[model samples]
Target: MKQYLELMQKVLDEGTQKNDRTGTGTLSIFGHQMRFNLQDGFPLVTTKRCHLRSIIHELLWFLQGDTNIAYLHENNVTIWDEWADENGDLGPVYGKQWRAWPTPDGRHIDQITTVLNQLKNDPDSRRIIVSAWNVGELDKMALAPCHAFFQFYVADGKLSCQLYQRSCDVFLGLPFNIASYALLVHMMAQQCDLEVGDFVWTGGDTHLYSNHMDQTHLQLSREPRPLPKLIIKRKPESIFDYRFEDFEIEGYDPHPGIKAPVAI
Candidate 1:
């Protein structure tokens, strides 16, 4: 977790002030990368208590190829509520792009299944990747994908992932993105029967909103507790079949939750 703290410190120390689409001012930087070893523990930030409920539901929703917020609502997750339009639709966001990317020839490609096949049959191949930044469909999405592209690498029977986020809100969004992708890696590794390796995060246009400065400082002032372990109770038949009840977090003791306004 020190890596995350260091990233925040670097932005605070040297980031340039910039204005963004939401008209909220930000302290921004160009690029940054961090890596977390899965064996060490789950990479949920320990400086502040983070509830994983929404994140888990969000990931499950994405895997379901659902573009509507109905499933999330049924699960008691409301993070996507603000972005959804009437009828609980979010257009073609991550769920649609990842699971049903349409082609000009009228075929929808399932990138998740494709990647899973590649990981199982061609572990050494370098083309194992997924991208939510569908250029043609970006206009329809409620929110453009920030953690847009990711690639998986398998070496020494261990599965690893690296995500490329085009825009990052360090104080608010980055931690969630980190945990989300890390959770993905764990699930993918388990599905493929490969040992968990590492999660590498690469960011572009990383920023901390000006309004979150106080929360960031408060978070920095606290010492990071031990990283918690993620416990998956059962292995589902496929990656898409996982339910929220199948997962749990152990040994997670941290400071109180910090409230910060979302830039959106």
Candidate 2:
């Protein structure tokens, strides 16, 4: 958790002020990265409380390649509500790219499926990766991919994942990004019968919105508690087979939640 706090503090100390599409100004920094060893514990933020329900349901929603908010609403997740139009549409976002990247031949490329196959068949392949950057489809996306690219590496009977986030709202978005993908790595390790290794989060254009400055101060003031443990109740047959009830978290005691407005 100190790694996360260091990032927060670094952004405050050295970031440059810049305007953004959301009309709220931001103090931005170019690139930053941090790694979490799965053995330490699940990397949920301890300085402030965050909703695991939304994180889990949201990832499941994306894995289904859904661009609409209906599924999220059915699960009581509202994070994407602000971005959704009257039709509950968010265009081709992470879910669409992760599951179905369209091709000129009218075929959809399943990036996640491909990665799963790679992890199983060729654990040593350096090209094992999943990308959310669909060049021709960017215009149709509601929000540009922030956590855009990720790759997997296997060694010493351990599986590790590296995520590259192109645009990060550090104060609000970075923590969730870490946890969500860490959860993914855990799920993948289980499916592949490999031990969890590390989760590396690389950020680009990382920024803290002006409105979140005070909130950031409060968060940095608190001390990080012991990290929680991730417990997967059942082994799903495939990566896509997980249900919300399958995940159980142990020993998570954190400070109270902090409130900050999203830039949307």
Candidate 3:
């Protein structure tokens, strides 16, 4: 949680002014990284309360290879509604790419499955990666994948993952992104019967929207609570089978939620 606040303060103190497509404007910086040791507890931001429900559902939705918001809506999550079209479609976004990346030869590559196989059989290999930034399909996506690429590494019987996010909404979106990937690493580690290690988050174009400055300062004024512990009720059949009820976050005390607009 300190890492998140530090990024916020860094942007407040040293970030450059920039305009964006949303017309919200931002204090932006480029190329930042944060590392979280999963053993230290789940890295859900404690400076302000975050909705773990939405985060969990969103991740599960991605793993299911669903590019529509119907599942999200059925679960009472509306975060993706803004980007969906009339048919509740988001094009070939994270879900489609993560679970079924289309190849030129008319075959679909399951990146998540590839990573699982590699982790189980070839932990030391450098090719254990799952990428969602399919250049050929970007134009069809409602929004380009911000957390586009991630790699898994195994060392000392522990599993580690590093996410390379091309763009980050430091104030509004980073908290969810951190927790989502951390949860992913936990699930992956569990499936491979390995201990969890670190989640290294590398970012580009990290920024705080001008409208969120007030909320940012309010959050900064609060002290961080102890990070929550995530308990997966049961290890499902596979990584793709986790449901929302399977996760429980314990001891997640934090400040009240801060409302800020999403920059579309």
Candidate 4:
């Protein structure tokens, strides 16, 4: 968490002001990276409490290959509310691209399942990658995925995941981004019967939005609590079978929640 706070402070102290699609301009930077080891604890931010429910449910929803906001709303998760269309559609966002990306020939591909299979079968394949930045589907999306692509590396019976986020709103999005990808790595490792390794997060256009500058500063001044431990109650044979209540976090003591509006 100290690493995260340092990132926020760096952007505010030296980032260049720039305009963005959200009309909420940002003080932007080019590149940044963070690594978290799952052996210690879950990577959920403790400087301020992040809603684990939304993070968990959202990850599950993505694993289900559902781009519709219907499931998310049904779970009382409003994080995706602002991005949905009239039919509660978010187009080929994370879930669609990850699990059932459509091809021009009316075929579909599930990158998550594919990656797992590849890790088991062809460990040395450099092509063990999942990408959400479907160029053909970009126009159909409410918002293009910012955490656009991720690659998995398998070595020494350990699975490591590295995410390449082409754009990020550092203050608000980075925390969730860290937790989400870390969880993904953990789940994938479990499915592959491999040990959890490192989660490496790489970013581009990582910035702090103008409105969140003061809040970011406030957070930097606080001390981080011990990293939270995630307890998975049931070990499902399939990754898709994980439910909301199947996971819990213990030893998460943190400061009060910080309210920040999404740029959208």
Model 1, CA-based lDDT: 0.94
Residue pairs clashing in model 2 are: none
Q: For every model shown, what is its TM-score relative to the native structure?
A: 0.98, 0.97, 0.98, 0.95
Alpha-carbon lDDT of model 4? 0.87
Model 3 Cα lDDT, one tens digit per residue, 103-169: 9999999999999999999999999999999999999999999999999999999999999998888
Over 4 Å off, model 4: 262-264
User: In candidate 2, how many Å is residue 173 off?
Assistant: 0.8
lDDT, residue 172, model 1? 87
| lDDT of each residue in 1-264, candidate 4, tens digit only | 877887888888888989886598889889888888888899888999888788888999999998888888887898888888888988889899999988999999988889888988998789999999999999998988888989999888888889999998777788888998888788888878898888988988988878886788788879998999888888898989998888888999988888877555
Structural RMSD, model 2:
1.2
Model 1 ranges with Cα > 4 A deviation: 262-264
Q: What value of lDDT does candidate 3 attain over all alpha carbons?
A: 0.93
The global C-alpha lDDT for each of the candidates, from Candidate 1 onward, is 0.94, 0.91, 0.93, 0.87
* Clash count of each predicted structure: 0, 0, 0, 0
Q: How far in Å is the alpha carbon of 215 misplaced in model 2?
A: 1.2
Using lDDT as the measure, what is the rank order of every candidate, best first?
1, 3, 2, 4
lDDT of 1 by residue, 64-117 (tens): 999999999998889988889889999999999999999999999999999999
